[PDB]
């Protein structure tokens, strides 16, 4: 046989939360600020 | 006379005489010694990545 018959270390497999939720940060921030400038407007 | 780390085999018995064995041995398996010293500083932040 030439094809045969552990301590995994995560690097970016979990990073997918970042470019989505972290984006949602500035999302809700911007939307909120729009609501505020509309209210004061 | 021959005194040496000589293996006793039948073909060797069949031609000369061996005394009683003063040292009993067997086949051995020699491998390397992989040493992974436990880090002191970086082993703290070890698991995922810095």
Short mmCIF file of C-alpha atoms in Angstrom, two decimals:
data_model
loop_
_atom_site.label_atom_id
_atom_site.label_comp_id
_atom_site.label_asym_id
_atom_site.label_seq_id
_atom_site.Cartn_x
_atom_site.Cartn_y
_atom_site.Cartn_z
CA UNK A 1 0.00 0.00 0.00
CA UNK A 2 1.13 3.51 -0.90
CA UNK A 3 -1.80 5.47 0.58
CA UNK A 4 -1.46 4.62 4.26
CA UNK A 5 -4.36 3.16 6.21
CA UNK A 6 -4.70 15.47 16.14
CA UNK A 7 -3.65 18.68 17.93
CA UNK A 8 -5.66 20.93 15.65
CA UNK A 9 -4.93 24.65 15.95
CA UNK A 10 -7.60 27.04 14.66
CA UNK A 11 -6.26 29.97 12.63
CA UNK A 12 -9.09 31.51 10.61
CA UNK A 13 -11.77 28.79 10.42
CA UNK A 14 -13.76 30.78 12.99
CA UNK A 15 -12.94 34.19 11.51
CA UNK A 16 -16.08 34.09 9.35
CA UNK A 17 -18.03 35.72 12.18
CA UNK A 18 -15.89 38.82 11.75
CA UNK A 19 -16.60 40.10 8.27
CA UNK A 20 -20.33 39.62 8.90
CA UNK A 21 -21.07 40.59 12.49
CA UNK A 22 -18.26 43.14 12.61
CA UNK A 23 -19.84 44.55 9.46
CA UNK A 24 -23.17 44.59 11.29
CA UNK A 25 -21.46 46.80 13.86
CA UNK A 26 -20.98 49.71 11.49
CA UNK A 27 -24.30 48.70 9.97
CA UNK A 28 -26.42 49.29 13.07
CA UNK A 29 -24.15 52.22 13.95
CA UNK A 30 -24.76 54.00 10.64
CA UNK A 31 -28.49 53.18 10.58
CA UNK A 32 -28.85 54.40 14.16
CA UNK A 33 -27.00 57.65 13.46
CA UNK A 34 -29.33 58.16 10.50
CA UNK A 35 -32.29 57.77 12.85
CA UNK A 36 -30.74 60.32 15.21
CA UNK A 37 -29.93 62.95 12.57
CA UNK A 38 -33.47 62.46 11.28
CA UNK A 39 -34.95 62.97 14.75
CA UNK A 40 -32.90 66.10 15.44
CA UNK A 41 -33.54 67.18 11.84
CA UNK B 1 39.78 -19.47 22.85
CA UNK B 2 37.32 -16.78 21.77
CA UNK B 3 35.71 -14.43 24.30
CA UNK B 4 33.62 -11.74 22.62
CA UNK B 5 30.02 -10.44 22.38
CA UNK B 6 29.30 -13.43 20.17
CA UNK B 7 25.80 -14.69 19.42
CA UNK B 8 25.31 -18.39 20.08
CA UNK B 9 23.69 -20.19 17.14
CA UNK B 10 23.19 -23.81 16.17
CA UNK B 11 25.62 -23.70 13.24
CA UNK B 12 28.13 -22.23 15.69
CA UNK B 13 27.43 -24.98 18.23
CA UNK B 14 27.76 -27.58 15.47
CA UNK B 15 31.46 -26.80 15.00
CA UNK B 16 32.80 -25.70 18.42
CA UNK B 17 31.72 -25.62 22.05
CA UNK B 18 30.13 -22.69 23.86
CA UNK B 19 30.10 -22.27 27.62
CA UNK B 20 26.92 -21.48 29.51
CA UNK B 21 25.68 -17.98 28.65
CA UNK B 22 27.01 -15.32 30.99
CA UNK B 23 24.73 -12.71 29.42
CA UNK B 24 21.26 -13.17 27.95
CA UNK B 25 20.15 -10.81 25.19
CA UNK B 26 17.39 -10.31 22.66
CA UNK B 27 16.67 -8.37 19.50
CA UNK B 28 16.32 -4.65 20.17
CA UNK B 29 14.55 -1.79 18.42
CA UNK B 30 16.50 1.47 18.12
CA UNK B 31 14.60 4.64 17.26
CA UNK B 32 15.30 8.35 17.68
CA UNK B 33 14.44 10.36 20.80
CA UNK B 34 11.90 13.02 19.70
CA UNK B 35 12.10 15.70 22.40
CA UNK B 36 9.45 18.44 22.43
CA UNK B 37 10.28 20.72 25.35
CA UNK B 38 7.25 22.43 26.86
CA UNK B 39 7.45 26.16 26.03
CA UNK B 40 7.30 28.64 28.89
CA UNK B 41 6.03 31.87 27.35
CA UNK B 42 4.38 31.07 24.01
CA UNK B 43 2.72 27.93 25.42
CA UNK B 44 0.30 30.31 27.16
CA UNK B 45 -1.17 31.81 23.98
CA UNK B 46 -0.58 28.45 22.27
CA UNK B 47 -4.00 27.04 21.33
CA UNK B 48 -5.40 29.04 18.44
CA UNK B 49 -2.99 31.70 17.11
CA UNK B 50 -1.46 35.04 18.05
#
